[PDB]
Design a protein around this ligand. Sequence first.
Ligand code: PLP
Ligand code: PLP
Ligand code: CL
Ligand code: CL
Ligand code: CL
Ligand code: CL
Ligand code: MG
Ligand code: MG
Ligand code: MG
Ligand code: MG
Ligand code: MG
Lengths: 355, 358
Amino acid sequence: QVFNFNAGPSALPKPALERAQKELLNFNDTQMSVMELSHRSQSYEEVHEQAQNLLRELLQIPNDYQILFLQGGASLQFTMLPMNLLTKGTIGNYVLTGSWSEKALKEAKLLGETHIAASTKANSYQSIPDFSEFQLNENDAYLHITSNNTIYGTQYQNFPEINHAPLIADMSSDILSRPLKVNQFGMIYAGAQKNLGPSGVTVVIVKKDLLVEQVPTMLQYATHIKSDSLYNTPPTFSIYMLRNVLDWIKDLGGAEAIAKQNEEKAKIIYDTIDESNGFYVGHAEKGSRSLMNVTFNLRNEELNQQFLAKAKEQGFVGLNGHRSVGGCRASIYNAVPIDACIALRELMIQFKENA
Amino acid sequence: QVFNFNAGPSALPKPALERAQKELLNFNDTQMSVMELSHRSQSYEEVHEQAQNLLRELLQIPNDYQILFLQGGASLQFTMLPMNLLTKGTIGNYVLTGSWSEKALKEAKLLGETHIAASTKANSYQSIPDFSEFQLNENDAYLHITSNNTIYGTQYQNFPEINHAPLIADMSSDILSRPLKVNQFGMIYAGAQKNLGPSGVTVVIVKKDLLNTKVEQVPTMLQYATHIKSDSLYNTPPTFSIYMLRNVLDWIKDLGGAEAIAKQNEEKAKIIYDTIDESNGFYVGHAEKGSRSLMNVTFNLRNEELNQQFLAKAKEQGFVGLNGHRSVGGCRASIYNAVPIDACIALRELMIQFKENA
Ligand SMILES: *Cc1c(COP(=O)(O)O)cnc(C)c1O
Ligand SMILES: *Cc1c(COP(=O)(O)O)cnc(C)c1O
Ligand SMILES: [Cl-]
Ligand SMILES: [Cl-]
Ligand SMILES: [Cl-]
Ligand SMILES: [Cl-]
Ligand SMILES: [Mg+2]
Ligand SMILES: [Mg+2]
Ligand SMILES: [Mg+2]
Ligand SMILES: [Mg+2]
Ligand SMILES: [Mg+2]
């Protein structure tokens, strides 16, 4: 028995992997792997387009947005965004809700004026700040948020109505885990390796008209928009796998259906914490609790380590919290099945009963 | 019948793919795919390290060089190289031997002073210029070359001895197709998808002391130092692509390494160039003979109607990828390491029959 709670890269749907295995040597009767196709072939172009189409359908992405498939991870987006939009006399305004927010802010500071609209850093990122607290500037280039704060286990329940500058979100750890109103954003980005696919491709959803002389060709959004993410060779297998994952989400009923599964998964772990009479304590304020990364600790470090060691012995993978914060983190992205969360509960109850 | 002459991504050695298929769901007894593992797991770390160690052994990479695995393609390297080394007061000096050379130069121009050391552009890139032609500057930041000019079908036979600045090479389409004296270079880069397997990873072989220092003003992800210090694990790497690279490198080693693959590549290139040369001008190769690539064989028939008819027949007969690059037309047989010799035999037979029946 293995239970895959890895935080990134992460569990993928079994049907998507089984499909990939079956046709790894002979894709679509071509007698070649999808990995052996030219990216300028109709065979590959169909897959590329179908990944975009499924994202568009599943997230209900309006026609005035384009869907980009880029290399470099979300971390490259931390610099590519200000490189394109943080122009002279404008401000890259950030809401800090965890360490990933901080890493994005850091890259903008190298390129122009920045600002902190709001922050829960002083309280160790236990919550999402009230939107009424945001400090906005007329010359903001954008307002950047982190929808799901992967290390801290907090998540935006809803998104602010921002009209003075585009809203930009790092959705790496919760994209397509629930329906979204894409019209609230100027740009959304996410490495694929938590909810959408394997590592090596980054999805960027951008309002077309939003997006640069002096910027290197590969680092302009415009390059990729105009070329439909085929300016240079894309990560063809990663985009194929993304397509397979998106087919799986569609087959189960789409974003509302996966949201219901993810809410049940999270409920199992949070009820276990809440009913534990303080033996397990979550990091996040209840009102900010993530459905994607559940962070918690036991009453002392010795017990934390004992629990994590027992989990590892019993086949659980990935539960150690991020190094920077310690404790435990159960990552329960889309393809983590409910039975793994049940198994984690049962382990948690047995461990407490035998403590 | 399928014959895969795709130019990028391209044929993989079947055992690398069969290995990946077999263990796609349960890698190293973990009951997870390599695609589902942490990059900090022992199972992945072993793959990441073995890929480096296989490249090191196969190319005889000295210990003062590091192997980086980066995202972004060779195209991102066209900007990352000048961003890190083209400093104020210095020149990015380029040898133009094809379109990919031009694309690299274009990115440097956005960032600093550039120069053209030598060029065969005026003659449509039929050859590699003689090294005696190279115009060097005392303030060169580097001299950049393209070892195999993938669109034009020409290739360096050997490499210049440069002492005034580091020699940098885009080796995307011929890396590890033959032995290489890595110590001639300050940096070598290659998208993996021509001769080393997967798209989505770029191999960068760097002389550590040339590039391990922070570069003021350059974004974290775009500094070589970031990736050198973190062993290409600064952010999440393209784990499946690096895994597949490992599998391809295991295959190259198994077949006898760089020396053995060179022998194989020379043989299968000769099959196609002999067909051209014995065709009494029915097929005309683009490259001058002294510069002919072992990796991309470029040619035309006597007019565009015949080119179209040949390519249409090829496709009907199961050949994939023979259309020349859009920018130049004609035909291009890409014959990277993993293209089997019997595909080259089949192409010869197609070419002879088409000639005879024309
Ligand atoms: C996973 C993660 C990242 C880092 O992504 P890379 O692809 O490794 O650069 C960035 N932001 C958030 C919120 C993450 O969860
Ligand atoms: C394939 C190729 C490139 C482009 O590589 P990408 O990974 O698509 O950016 C650059 N240089 C040469 C010589 C090539 O053959
Ligand atoms: Cl975080
Ligand atoms: Cl994280
Ligand atoms: Cl070229
Ligand atoms: Cl090419
Ligand atoms: Mg918290
Ligand atoms: Mg379906
Ligand atoms: Mg209850
Ligand atoms: Mg071996
Ligand atoms: Mg055969």
